[PDB]
Amino acid sequence: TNRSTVKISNVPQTIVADELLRFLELHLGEDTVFALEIPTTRDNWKPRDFARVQFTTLEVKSRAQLLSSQSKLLFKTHNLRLSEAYDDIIPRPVDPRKRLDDIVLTVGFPESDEKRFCALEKWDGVRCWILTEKRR
Amino acid sequence: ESSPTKVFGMDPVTRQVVVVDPEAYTYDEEVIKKAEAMGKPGLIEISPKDDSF
Amino acid sequence: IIMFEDIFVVDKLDPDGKKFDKVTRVEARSHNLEMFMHLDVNTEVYPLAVGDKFTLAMAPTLNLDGTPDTLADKYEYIMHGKLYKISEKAELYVSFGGLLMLLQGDPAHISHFELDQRLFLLMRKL
C-alpha cells in the first residue's frame, strides 16, 4: 500500500503495451493508468513474460487487486495475476494535492537580523513534488 | 458478421442477438473463436445432437 | 474405507489459462495438515478457479466393506491410478493413466500406503 505500481505476473508474449492499456481502461476506469512498462530481454523485439503498471489513484489499485483476487481479469485467455512491485516506474506522488504546478521559486538567505529576506534569482513556472515515502 | 452463414440474427426492438435458422450452422467454429477472442469463453455454446438428423 | 481425506484450497494454476485446450496442473495446500499437492486436472470438463475449496479422498476400492478391484454418488471426479514412487516430509507419486499426482505432506500423515498398489481419487468442490 506504500506504492501505486502493480506487477502483472503473466502476460501473452504477442501483445503490445497499447493492447494491455486498452484492456485495463476497459475493465477499470477511463484513463486510470499512468505508466505501463513491459521489460524486454532484447532491445526492442523480445518482451518478457511479466509487466509493471502504475495506477493514478490507490482506489484504482485496490479495485484492480480485488478483481485479480477473484480471477475476473481475462486478457486473451490469460488470467492476469497482480503482485506488489519493488520500485515505482516514475517517482510521482499519488496525492494530487502535493503536486504543485506553475509556482514561483526563489533562493536567498536571512540577510538582515530583522524579518527581512533577500532574493538572488527567481524562477517562474517550476514544478514541486513532495514524496513522503522517499522523504525528499 | 463473424459467422460465415446466416445463423444468428439481430433484433432491433430488443437490441440483442437471436437464433434464426439454426440448421445452417455448418459446424464452422468461427463465432466461438470470435467470442473467445473478444474475451468471453462461455458466451455461445453449440453442440451437435446425437439422436437428431 | 477412506485412507486420506482432507479439505484442500487451490493456490495457483500452472497454465493460468481459461481456454488453453490443455491439461492444467493445480497447486493446492491442505488445511490443518500442511500438505502440498500437485494434480493434473481438465478445466474444460471440470472447472476449477483460484481460491475454491474442494475435498479429496483416497480409497483402495469403491465398494463397501471389501471387494477390492458405492461411493460414486457422493463425489464427482473419481479417478483410478497406481502409486509407483514413494521416496521423498514423505511424498507420493500416483499416475492416473499418465496424469501425475504429487502429494507432499508429513511422514506421520502418510504411513498406510504400499508400493505398486491401485487406489482411487475422490474429489468434490463442496
From Swiss-Prot, chain A:
Location in or out of the cell: Nucleus, Nucleoplasm; Nucleus, Nucleolus; Nucleus
Deletion consequences: Late flowering and absence of siRNAs derived from FWA tandem repeat regions. Loss of de novo methylation. Increased expression of retrotransposon-derived solo long terminal repeat (solo LTR) and SDC due to their derepression; levels are even higher in the double mutant rdr2-1 jmj24-1.
Family designation: Belongs to the RdRP family.
Function, as annotated: RNA-dependent direct polymerase involved in the production of small interfering RNAs (siRNAs). Binds to single-stranded RNA (ssRNA); engages ssRNAs longer than 7 nucleotides and initiates internal to their 3' ends. Able to transcribe the RNA of an RNA/DNA hybrid, the transcript produced by Pol IV, if its 3' end is accessible, to generate double-stranded small interfering RNAs (dsRNAs) precursor essential for establishing and maintaining DNA methylation.
Record's subunit section: Interacts with NRPD1 and SHH1. Associates with Pol IV complex, forming an interpolymerase channel bridging their active sites, through which the Pol IV-generated transcript is handed over to the RDR2 active site after being backtracked, where it is used as the template for double-stranded RNA (dsRNA) synthesis. Interacts with JMJ24.
Note: RDR2 is non-functional in the absence of associated Pol IV.
Protein name from the UniProt record: RNA-dependent RNA polymerase 2
Organism: Arabidopsis thaliana (Mouse-ear cress)
Residues of the full protein shown: 7 to 142 of 1133
Swiss-Prot record, chain B:
Locations listed in the record: Nucleus
UniProt superkingdom: Eukaryota
Regions that span the bilayer: none
Quaternary structure note: Component of the RNA polymerase II complex consisting of at least 12 subunits. Interacts with SHH1, CLSY1, NRPB11 and NRPD1. Interacts with IYO.
Protein function: DNA-dependent RNA polymerase catalyzes the transcription of DNA into RNA using the four ribonucleoside triphosphates as substrates. Component of RNA polymerase II which synthesizes mRNA precursors and many functional non-coding RNAs. Pol II is the central component of the basal RNA polymerase II transcription machinery. It is composed of mobile elements that move relative to each other. NRPB3 is part of the core element with the central large cleft and the clamp element that moves to open and close the cleft.
Similarity remark: Belongs to the archaeal Rpo3/eukaryotic RPB3 RNA polymerase subunit family.
Protein name as annotated: DNA-directed RNA polymerases II, IV and V subunit 3
Organism per entry: Arabidopsis thaliana (Mouse-ear cress)
Curated annotation (Swiss-Prot), chain C:
GO biological process: DNA-templated transcription
GO cellular component: RNA polymerase II, core complex; RNA polymerase IV complex; RNA polymerase V complex
SS bond partners: none
Family matches, as SMART domains: RPOL8c (SM00658)
A Pfam family the protein falls into: RNA_pol_Rpb8
Keyword list, A-Z: Nucleus
Subcellular localization, as worded in the UniProt entry: Nucleus
Keyword Cell division: no
Subunit structure: Component of the RNA polymerase II, IV and V complexes. Associates with the mediator complex.
Family statement: Belongs to the eukaryotic RPB8 RNA polymerase subunit family.
Purpose of the protein: DNA-dependent RNA polymerase catalyzes the transcription of DNA into RNA using the four ribonucleoside triphosphates as substrates. Component of RNA polymerase II which synthesizes mRNA precursors and many functional non-coding RNAs. Pol II is the central component of the basal RNA polymerase II transcription machinery. It is composed of mobile elements that move relative to each other.
Record protein name field: DNA-directed RNA polymerases II, IV and V subunit 8B
Gene from which the chain derives: NRPB8B
